Write an enzyme that holds these catalytic residues in place. Structure first.
Site, PDB file in Angstrom:
ATOM      1  CG  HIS A   1      -2.266   0.672   0.936  1.00 26.19           C
ATOM      2  ND1 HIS A   1      -3.454  -0.016   0.814  1.00 26.19           N
ATOM      3  CD2 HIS A   1      -2.577   1.986   0.822  1.00 26.19           C
ATOM      4  CE1 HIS A   1      -4.439   0.844   0.607  1.00 26.19           C
ATOM      5  NE2 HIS A   1      -3.935   2.065   0.615  1.00 26.19           N
TER       6      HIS A   1
ATOM      7  CG  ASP B   1       1.132  -0.985  -5.615  1.00 25.32           C
ATOM      8  OD1 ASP B   1       1.735  -1.377  -4.596  1.00 25.32           O
ATOM      9  OD2 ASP B   1      -0.065  -0.642  -5.581  1.00 25.32           O
TER      10      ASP B   1
ATOM     11  N   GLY C   1       1.268   5.134  -8.601  1.00 27.11           N
ATOM     12  CA  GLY C   1       0.399   5.975  -7.799  1.00 27.11           C
ATOM     13  C   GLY C   1       0.876   7.411  -7.708  1.00 27.11           C
TER      14      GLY C   1
HETATM   15  C1  LIG Z   1      -5.337   7.360   2.139  1.00 24.55           C
HETATM   16  O1  LIG Z   1      -5.175   6.093   1.491  1.00 24.55           O
HETATM   17  C2  LIG Z   1      -6.405   5.517   1.377  1.00 24.55           C
HETATM   18  O2  LIG Z   1      -7.429   6.059   1.795  1.00 24.55           O
HETATM   19  O3  LIG Z   1      -6.414   4.281   0.785  1.00 24.55           O
HETATM   20  O4  LIG Z   1      -5.332   4.088  -0.227  1.00 24.55           O
HETATM   21  C3  LIG Z   1      -5.398   4.396  -1.583  1.00 24.55           C
HETATM   22  N1  LIG Z   1      -5.424   5.767  -1.718  1.00 24.55           N
HETATM   23  C4  LIG Z   1      -4.189   6.283  -1.762  1.00 24.55           C
HETATM   24  C5  LIG Z   1      -4.002   7.650  -1.567  1.00 24.55           C
HETATM   25  C6  LIG Z   1      -2.722   8.190  -1.627  1.00 24.55           C
HETATM   26  C7  LIG Z   1      -2.543   9.564  -1.434  1.00 24.55           C
HETATM   27  C8  LIG Z   1      -1.639   7.354  -1.880  1.00 24.55           C
HETATM   28  C9  LIG Z   1      -0.346   7.862  -1.935  1.00 24.55           C
HETATM   29  C10 LIG Z   1      -1.831   5.988  -2.066  1.00 24.55           C
HETATM   30  C11 LIG Z   1      -3.098   5.427  -1.974  1.00 24.55           C
HETATM   31  N2  LIG Z   1      -3.280   4.099  -2.200  1.00 24.55           N
HETATM   32  C12 LIG Z   1      -2.128   3.211  -2.544  1.00 24.55           C
HETATM   33  C13 LIG Z   1      -1.922   3.091  -4.049  1.00 24.55           C
HETATM   34  O5  LIG Z   1      -3.045   2.415  -4.614  1.00 24.55           O
HETATM   35  C14 LIG Z   1      -0.657   2.269  -4.370  1.00 24.55           C
HETATM   36  O6  LIG Z   1      -0.624   1.005  -3.693  1.00 24.55           O
HETATM   37  C15 LIG Z   1       0.610   2.979  -3.973  1.00 24.55           C
HETATM   38  O7  LIG Z   1       0.451   4.402  -3.972  1.00 24.55           O
HETATM   39  C16 LIG Z   1       1.604   2.561  -5.053  1.00 24.55           C
HETATM   40  O8  LIG Z   1       2.857   3.030  -4.661  1.00 24.55           O
HETATM   41  P1  LIG Z   1       3.488   4.349  -5.306  1.00 24.55           P
HETATM   42  O9  LIG Z   1       2.577   5.624  -4.900  1.00 24.55           O
HETATM   43  O10 LIG Z   1       3.416   4.287  -6.896  1.00 24.55           O
HETATM   44  O11 LIG Z   1       4.892   4.409  -4.863  1.00 24.55           O
HETATM   45  C17 LIG Z   1      -4.528   3.599  -2.171  1.00 24.55           C
HETATM   46  N3  LIG Z   1      -4.738   2.294  -2.422  1.00 24.55           N
HETATM   47  C18 LIG Z   1      -5.968   1.776  -2.356  1.00 24.55           C
HETATM   48  O12 LIG Z   1      -6.178   0.587  -2.614  1.00 24.55           O
HETATM   49  N4  LIG Z   1      -7.015   2.636  -2.044  1.00 24.55           N
HETATM   50  C19 LIG Z   1      -6.720   3.981  -1.787  1.00 24.55           C
HETATM   51  O13 LIG Z   1      -7.650   4.726  -1.468  1.00 24.55           O
END
Ligand SMILES: COC(=O)OO[C@@]12Nc3cc(C)c(C)cc3N(C[C@H](O)[C@H](O)[C@H](O)COP(=O)(O)O)C1=NC(=O)NC2=O
Ligand SMILES: COC(=O)OO[C@@]12Nc3cc(C)c(C)cc3N(C[C@H](O)[C@H](O)[C@H](O)COP(=O)(O)O)C1=NC(=O)NC2=O
Ligand SMILES: COC(=O)OO[C@@]12Nc3cc(C)c(C)cc3N(C[C@H](O)[C@H](O)[C@H](O)COP(=O)(O)O)C1=NC(=O)NC2=O
Ligand SMILES: COC(=O)OO[C@@]12Nc3cc(C)c(C)cc3N(C[C@H](O)[C@H](O)[C@H](O)COP(=O)(O)O)C1=NC(=O)NC2=O
Lengths: 327, 327, 327, 327
Positions: free
Chosen positions: D223, D254, D277
């Site tokens: 995550h 990821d 992300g």
């Molecule tokens: C506050 O977070 C939250 O409410 O839930 O997390 C998510 N939102 C979310 C919000 C933000 C600001 C960031 C930086 C990552 C996530 N992520 C993780 C993302 O999907 C990648 O796994 C990771 O970012 C890859 O790594 P990388 O950035 O490329 O280095 C989320 N994943 C979910 O499944 N659902 C979400 O809502």
């Protein structure tokens, strides 16, 4: 070693960055050095050193050191005498000099200097221009075709892109490109009696196939960190490749050789010889032909010193040294 | 430990660099320390410590600590009393002192101090001067010949070359060199009843051969990082060498011993004893004989402390400790 | 975590150094942290978390967290209420509190606070005073004797020696020492019905012997880096020790636990519980009993959070998690 | 890559920290990058590259790159066009876009943009609202349900707690939560014909169980270091998970993908595709839809470059590359 200071001062910023740089984040450029620094030699003591010799036989010819000058394009970027100054110093040192396809002086002129020049080939879209270039090298007295096989296209040099660097005025004196494949290698091999040396081999099975393909040598090399960013360093694959080839061709290595001790490390890992690239250009930018001659003289002294301190009267004995990986 | 500060302040710049320096990039000098810092001791608890003793028997004689003063040439470079001050402090501490071939006071004088001096031999181009030097040491009452075998010639000290350092005025008081081989070792062995100790062994098969050659001991050592730059640290080869020798000779180690805990680590890896070099000279430059005596007193306290905290009533118990490699 | 700032500001320099320091070069103090940071947990997903509980049964009693307050001597050095404030907060948090032999408030008073106090024993030169101290602890209602076995004598604290630190005015309220051996352990064991817990075990065979000796628990511990400098961290030996003991006693670990995630890591490596030392004193120096209560509340929240994110409804499930070593 | 500078300048401090941050000490956030940097690719040479293609088939549909936009909540926090700008750029680039449960624009609107949107599901306390949300996504034309399984609750974000950060004004446009279990996964699976993709799998046996449970894919992911602090990086578990799944589902990864070379590394370790992300949000905050389009264009160029330099004409060939772990 030292000389890099002098090179930076006298060279323009975009030219020095062109010489020093790697692709992408330069992960593989840095890893070439970190890999070498992790290698420790286990020296042998109390052996006869009455006649320590750094000479090797390679591609039918005696060389003064287990070392050749690596192909580096457009050497007039670094000094007005360009390739001619390096070739003369290499000849005088007894070391092979690799003429580049993109030399800023014609290959026939460089070859006329004498010594034993090798010729580095980049494949051109025309099999016919490529094989003609090979014929020119062979007619000119070159001793080996160093077929570069890790440049289907140029890697992304972020230093050059930032600088917006371009070749001023220096030209490609050999001319009045395409990706190479194993068919291209066979075409070269069928067209020359010279040993064909594949430069840019990193996978064990590509080394095996190179021998099956009739190569006389390979250079285990990530192109000084200038092609695939994140490509393993050659020094990390060298021992495995040497075992897999089992004497079927010469195995050279390059990337980050910066001392006689590094040459010893490479030969203890099983290399036949090393190539040295950027340091030779630092010497060339600093003091022309005399600067290269001093570099090669100092390198010959350091290799001889390192070999004797390790108990090796010959490069063959140095290849039988053991190593240990450290931190 | 501390004392290095005081040594630098009182010593000239070129003299301190002469003492502290290594060859080349000083890769092996630094690796001696990094290798020791990676070693962790697994202590034993709840054993009888009613009579913890740091004494060992070595070469027929009891020593107060598993430790001797390493051969360091030209000790008058560091203090006017030179070798005589160190030998007196070593005698008073119950520790062997190694007289150098290049001592700045004659070996007969150093030996007259008493204690149990060892004599470090550099091979001279004359087998006859070499064996005469061995005879002088033996006539003088030396207890062991420490034949240095990792100096066919001096490694390239870049600190000294930069400084243009040279011996002022101090002289080689034993005189009014050539590479050693296994034949030279046999010649020494045939010429003396004293145990012959080969200093500078790093390969497992050279340790085996040293025993086959009749050596009474070896010192596993890269010469404090002063010979082959890139030579493995002795501490990294010590355990393998101890297993291969299987009690056939004493196995000492040196390089970077800077505390009683380091002595414990070396003995847990299987060493019979350590040599200590530069720290003794820091104490000598700082406060002469009294400075060395305090160093040895403090070292004896730290060794005793470390052994008891590890559950070892004797150095033999310390050799049976296990270790774990860390970061 | 945070609190260390506040502790340093409010505490005298020599008192903070007394609390924070380790022996020698503090190699083992730092290694406790580096070892934990290298451990990565492999979490499990999608398990029922309807009733996540951080409770454990240990030594016959339920604890709110897999955690106890480590024995730390002379707690009035950090706050005027000293041990009484910590014991009250531990009681209120449902966590065991370890009364020190060198407590600055008597053990009977600390025990009167309630909770479930443990008693840490240092062996005294008199088997009779030692066993009387054990009887006092047991009469006072202590639940376990934590026999410290890694202090035959105090390690060399270089911070204290530099400071010339000494206990002002605070006293050893339990009094109006000698090295412990396995015979001392048997004497304690024969004299009490309470579980005996050996604190300071690092060797696998000492853990096995502790079980054979009838110990009810061990604490795998290098004494927070305060005894043998260069002793392996407990966290590095924990997994091997847990396998060797095979459920024959409780296996606790301490050294560098600084978060709920660290507690999770320790339990995933197989620990029954952790001890926490310096952080509790930071909270005590910062804000007395309320400061410790907040620390324990926050720790309970972080443990619960970490366990649920790892898919563990119970500490037993957390012990079945796998780990991976990283950089 | 570059863009992070521009994002920080234009975004408020608490918003940038919200995007960049991880849980706890951010150990797992940093480890995602360190793990990738340790991976070196062994490139293959001399293969036909006449028609290098970065396309993959996944979940029944062709994608331009082995890559999708990761679910990132509340994208209007970064740019007024929010999710709509990212979805348009992803559509134009031929890359899947993952609609968040917590999107700041409704999922039906994002889906109307076209492309092939995926829908990320957070389980709600009502199985009925959860399954209705799944039905909405499927009615809207979404191609896959990305069931996030590593958030039974939100990890402890210390940057947000320090900032006292809160969502201003942006809303959860899909609404007018509970921990997921394997029963919840079965409920989703029984309720949809779309492939179900479990995001947040790190244990090998959870990957096996995901396949047994009927998942069409998994995302090996901690995550982005935002949930369990100290959770292993996905890239460290990817190879083991790929072998255990043995083609039974798509395996995405990821965490820290920051270049085309990183995409190559992930595919060489066996990933079907990556999610990206934070970089996409940097591009969105920097220059809206055009900024995302340029990021995706540049990424497509870097992936193609890296694949050809490694000798891979197709992503399938890239998955057969070997790797070596380094320093
Ligand atoms: C506050 O977070 C939250 O409410 O839930 O997390 C998510 N939102 C979310 C919000 C933000 C600001 C960031 C930086 C990552 C996530 N992520 C993780 C993302 O999907 C990648 O796994 C990771 O970012 C890859 O790594 P990388 O950035 O490329 O280095 C989320 N994943 C979910 O499944 N659902 C979400 O809502
Ligand atoms: C712009 O590059 C280009 O056009 O092609 O690359 C070459 N030119 C070239 C130019 C320059 C400036 C540098 C630094 C290296 C190369 N190299 C790599 C060199 O041969 C060694 O592999 C490496 O330098 C050893 O490492 P080291 O420097 O000692 O640490 C070339 N190799 C070829 O085969 N052909 C070339 O034209
Ligand atoms: C210029 O050197 C030279 O002439 O020959 O070297 C010796 N003189 C010598 C001189 C000096 C200044 C130093 C620092 C070391 C040596 N040493 C190495 C020493 O004996 C230990 O091996 C090492 O110092 C232990 O490591 P440590 O310092 O504790 O970390 C010598 N060894 C020999 O056998 N004969 C010598 O004359
Ligand atoms: C001067 O010390 C002394 O007299 O004896 O040591 C104790 N006193 C003691 C005092 C102080 C100031 C500190 C920091 C630790 C200890 N410790 C170690 C503690 O119990 C944990 O093992 C360690 O602190 C966990 O690591 P952590 O701090 O969480 O990183 C003691 N252990 C004993 O058994 N008896 C003691 O009296």
């Amino acid at each position: 070693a030292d000389l890099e200071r002098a090179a930076r001062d006298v060279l323009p910023g975009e030219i020095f960055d062109f010489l020093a740089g790697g692709s992408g984040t330069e992960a593989s450029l840095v890893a070439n050095r970190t890999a070498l620094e992790r290698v420790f030699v286990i020296p042998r003591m109390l052996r006869d050193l009455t006649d320590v010799t750094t000479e090797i036989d390679i591609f039918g010819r005696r060389a003064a050191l287990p070392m050749a000058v690596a192909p580096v394009a457009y050497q007039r970027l670094f000094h007005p005498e360009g390739e001619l100054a390096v070739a003369r110093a290499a000849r005088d040192a007894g070391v092979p000099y690799t003429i580049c396809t993109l030399s800023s002086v014609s290959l026939e002129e460089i070859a006329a200097v004498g010594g034993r020049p090798w010729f580095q080939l980049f494949w051109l879209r025309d099999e016919k221009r490529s094989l003609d270039l090979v014929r020119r090298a062979e007619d000119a007295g070159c001793e080996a075709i160093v077929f570069t096989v890790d440049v289907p296209w140029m890697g992304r040099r972020l230093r050059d892109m930032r600088n917006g660097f371009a070749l001023p005025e220096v030209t490609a004196a050999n001319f009045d490109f395409a990706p190479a494949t194993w068919e291209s290698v066979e075409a070269v091999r069928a067209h020359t009696d010279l040993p064909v040396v594949l430069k840019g081999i990193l996978a064990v099975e590509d080394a095996r196939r190179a021998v099956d393909a009739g190569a006389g040598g390979i250079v285990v090399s990530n192109h000084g960190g200038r092609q695939l960013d994140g490509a393993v360093p050659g020094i990390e694959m060298l021992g495995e490749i040497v075992a897999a080839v089992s004497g079927g061709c010469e195995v050279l290595v390059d990337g980050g050789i910066r001392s006689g001790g590094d040459v010893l490390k490479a030969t203890a890992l099983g290399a036949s010889a090393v190539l040295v690239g950027r340091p030779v250009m630092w010497a060339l930018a600093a003091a022309g032909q005399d600067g290269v001659r001093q570099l090669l003289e100092l390198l010959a002294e350091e290799v001889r010193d390192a070999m004797g301190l390790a108990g090796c009267e010959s490069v063959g004995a140095a290849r039988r040294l053991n190593t240990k990986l450290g931190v």
